[model samples]
Target: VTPRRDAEYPPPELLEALKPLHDICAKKTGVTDEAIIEFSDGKIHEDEKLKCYMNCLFHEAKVVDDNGDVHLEKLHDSLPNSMHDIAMHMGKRCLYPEGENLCEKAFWLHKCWKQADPKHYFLV
Candidate 1:
């Protein structure tokens, strides 16, 4: 089935909710929007800095904690009701591996979401 992209991509309002967090990450690190695009397809990298950056994002956004526990409910509350379901499906798919660090875990998460519904895969 061809997924509806309108439903896949976070609405501008949702993006707005994410902006402050993005700004925080940028000021704290050199991680750019383009940099994350690389892992959208699940490609994990070996860059320690990148991992740290992803880790910062996860924590700063309250998506996860220092213990690497995914705060499912808290994370969902971070987004809009309109995006809750899709985000839940995508977020859950981005699970952290026992031996992996944050950046690689982020890659795994993004990859699942990106591939979750190809027709509606993340795009502008």
Candidate 2:
């Protein structure tokens, strides 16, 4: 089952904790928060720095490995119980994302996530 439209995918506390990482990644990759905001608002920005920003965030969060392969279980478990089913379902569809590099792979994977569940999709 999919999460309710109002459901918070990452949960507020988790998103809060990841805020610093977001800033760090943004600073390191030269990706502005505006890029993320644009993406979150359902507009894709294919900036190279934005792609690497996504990779850095996922890597720092331990959601993906050094090679950019998603750890589905880790991602699934990070969400609330009510979200596990949808998380795994989408995770499987987006897992092992293909791209020329880690940054591109992470960016595509995140795009997949937003496509899979736009109403509940969130990024930090």
Candidate 3:
């Protein structure tokens, strides 16, 4: 299920805050946030290059630890005011799923958010 939203896309203020994340991901990996999810589908472990790019993206975002711990508060603080609630919702609801290992679970959790919302900035 998708989180509720009043708009078809991210508010302009959220877009402004998220730009750095998108830019860093693209600059470092030659992939846009959308393109990364569209291609990798979060099964990033299969490709070393994909994993490398994902690593770079996550590091740029500064949300997930290398050990798979997620800092929801840091993620919330990183957002534009308009984006905070949904970001927090998605983080809590989807950050870690049952049974998977740390990295893969985090990958899938991120994919779920990006796939659900058109406006989110999925850096990790």
Candidate 4:
């Protein structure tokens, strides 16, 4: 089935896969549930823990590596076929935000994506 861009959540399989990663990152970063909920709503709450939490998620998923560099190929390959175009577009536009560290960079990248297309944003 084709993925729906307006869907509030990711595909069920993807969502389930992200659940454990979220837990692990949350535990590691001590990110608050409120911050995560705000992120899902496309709000970029400026929280260091939240930023690192995002970095942790990307790192665990292999979308970004330990060096804070984005693995666009991995991201594209991992996403559902129907979502590739949007993901790729966002990656191209937002994957290279500058920061002193991986966590800050990942947060900015995520913020860019959320701003670039809030209607289609989905975070676990």
Collision count for each candidate, in order: 1, 0, 0, 0
Task: Find the 10 residues in a row with the least total lDDT in model 3.
Answer: 40-49
Model 1 C-alpha lDDT per residue in residues 1-124, reported as the tens digit of each score:
3544353365777667667876777667676555555443334344555555666667777878657655667767877777777776665655544336556665455455666654444421
Task: Put down candidate 4 lDDT per residue, 10-114, tens digits, no spaces.
Answer: 667778889999999999999999898788774567999999998899888878655657676777798777677777776677756878888888888888888
Please tell me which predicted candidate would have the highest lDDT against the true structure: 4
The CA lDDT at 96 in model 2 is 67
Kindly list the per-residue Cα lDDT of model 2 for residues 14-71, writing each as its tens digit.
6787888897898899987777877876565688888898888877778765555767
| Alpha-carbon runs more than 4 Å astray in model 2 | 1-10, 66-68
Clashing pairs in 2: none
Candidate 3 residue-wise lDDT, 1-124, digit = tens = 3333345445665556556866675676564455465443333223334444554545667866556455656667866776677777666656544434544544555556656553543342
In angstroms, how far off is 48's CA in candidate 2? 1.0
Question: Cα lDDT for residue 38, model 4?
Answer: 80
TM-score per candidate: 0.64, 0.82, 0.52, 0.85
Indicate whether candidate 2 or candidate 4 has the larger lDDT.
Answer: 4
Model 3's TM-score against the true structure: 0.52
Identify the runs in model 3 with alpha carbons over 4 angstroms from their true place: 1-8, 32-55, 64-69, 97-106, 114-124
* Clash pairs detected, candidate 3: none
**Which prediction has the highest TM-score against the true structure?**
4
